[PDB]
């Protein structure tokens, strides 16, 4: 029971990773969804500024990742993806994080081409009147503090629970002594009312809001509001019969209301946005899920349907140059531009054939649709697709086979999976051109259809615990973005065919009773088959080595992160956020941490991130901004040396 600081999370079982987001983590996260993925091999993070990075899994970006909060979806609204889904998610407020790698599940919605990421909160169940609380307080270099509170009280016929957080940090500095434009502020508060009329039933009401700020060194505008409101309803009846083992039903409402501007966290420079300017955009998502679990004999079957509708609006500021009067964005009416629908049916079937063999297969069928509400485009021109609808029905599915060896505690696995994903908001509305000879992006961007083989192994010995996961795949009609400066600067979305391949592996050895040593490796590769080029924004080879000493009451450990250069890039190509420009330099970062359990109710941890004050940037981080004094194409640098300490109470 020696307490530790997390520097990496293992594959505890084929393709799936499970972690507790309320334990301290070595390179210390913002209150950010993406930063809590940095400990899971396979993930990289596009740096935008201080917080709210854009997470990338085995080279893949964006909606190729299903990131659900409590089974529900939270979608932001900036055409920038300045408020990416994970900018609204504060992971210390949830109880469990779970990553399913590859297109190997169909329970959690459509388009899960790269992987599935589930943040969830667990129901409370008192057996009598009682009340537990969990809190944490953290403080660190450059004015970072994070405060989180999880309090609940109840009895056997119900409970009520409050979960909140407050977190911020000033601008950090790099390994060369410069202030990076990067400060941020975040808070959330969500309440849950839970009714438990017997030992099998649970109805839960949930409501919560949150807001935040964030200065972005990588952008021309900052996030001055990340307002979120959400509602939810859960139903869990258990053991309805000998065969129906669970029936779960849920509905969710998430509303995002974002503001980008160039005057509240910065000042307009000379550069093609010299005037004070702001843009307010919002996204209203409503959806539900309904699933029955059948368990009998050697079979488990999960059957269900789900649905989702979401709607996007925008409205912008207006600044008069003769009078220098600024009219804020909220003085103008809302302009709807997009509405999306998805309805889907799914099943997934597991066969427990003997104890050393399992075979899992799953299928789902989705009907996805979108309607363009833009009467005009922006000087305003008439929108050639104003009020057009497109739809499509996309089947997806997978089979996976897991076999355990007879002599050693080893599990081998191989799975083959197919994902079909209707296009994004950002892939359909944000690009200023479609494929060549096309009206718009909206009418010609084809859905992305990826087909991939997953394989790997698990091994759990007494002194050794190791895992490996490799993949090779093709992506048909990959949605790629191309950048050119010309009038001004503009993107074009196209559909290409892509080969991709890579993997991750990790191992932990227990040397002494007190010494542990772990390591992990992550490799991602991509090729644009249609132009005999490499795929853009692909993170380079990355290993992490770690040694820690435990002693019952406390623990100390060190960590080395080592990343190769990246030499395969596709210049002026990427996603809606970033573009490849230059090859990248390798680098190494070494860090220290420690943890001490003061008593059963209080724990202590601390660490030094980047001990040797390395000045370095990651291949995926955004470029500079010129307005912030950034050069030719300097990508935003990582933090330099940083100190932090955190106390955890639990009664």
Numbering used by the authors: 14 to 283, 285 to 392, 398 to 505, 507 to 671
Text of the article:
Here, we show that Pseudomonas aeruginosa OprC is an outer membrane, TonB-dependent transporter that is conserved in many Proteobacteria and which mediates acquisition of both reduced and oxidised ionic copper via an unprecedented CxxxM-HxM metal binding site. As indicated by the successful structure solution, OprC contains a single bound copper and shows the typical fold of a TBDT, with a large 22-stranded β-barrel occluded by an N-terminal approximately 15 kDa plug domain that, like in other TBDTs, completely occludes the lumen of the barrel. The copper binding site comprises residues Cys143 and Met147 in the plug domain and His323 and Met325 in the barrel wall. The CxxxM-HxM configuration, which coordinates the copper in a tetrahedral manner, is highly unusual and has, to our knowledge, not been observed before in copper homeostasis proteins.
To obtain copper-free OprC after purification from rich media, we constructed a variant (OprCAA) in which the binding site residues Cys143 and Met147 were both mutated to alanines. Even after equilibration of OprCAA for 30 min with 3 or 10 equivalents Cu(II), no coelution with metal is observed, indicating that high-affinity copper binding is completely abolished and confirming that the His7 tag does not bind Cu(II) with an affinity high enough to survive SEC, possibly due to the presence of 0.5 mM EDTA in the SEC buffer. The OprCAA structure was solved by molecular replacement (MR) using Cu-bound OprCWT as the search model. The binding site residues of both structures occupy very similar positions, indicating that the introduced mutations abolish copper binding without generating gross changes in the binding site. Superposition of the structures shows that for the remainder of the protein, structural changes upon copper binding are confined to the vicinity of the copper binding site, with parts far removed virtually unchanged (overall Cα RMSD approximately 1.0 Å). The largest change is observed for loop L11, which undergoes an inward-directed motion of approximately 8.0 Å upon copper binding (S3D, S3E). Some loop tips (e.g., L4, L5, L6) in OprCAA lack electron density for a limited number of residues, suggesting increased mobility. In the double mutant, copper becomes solvent accessible due to the absence of the Met147 side chain (S3D, S3E). In OprCAA, N-terminal density is visible up to Leu66 (i.e., the first 10 residues of the mature protein are disordered) including the Ton box (68PSVVTGV75), which is tucked away against the plug domain and the barrel wall. The observed position of the Ton box in OprCAA, likely hard to reach from the periplasmic space, would prevent nonproductive interactions of TonB with transporters that do not have substrate bound.
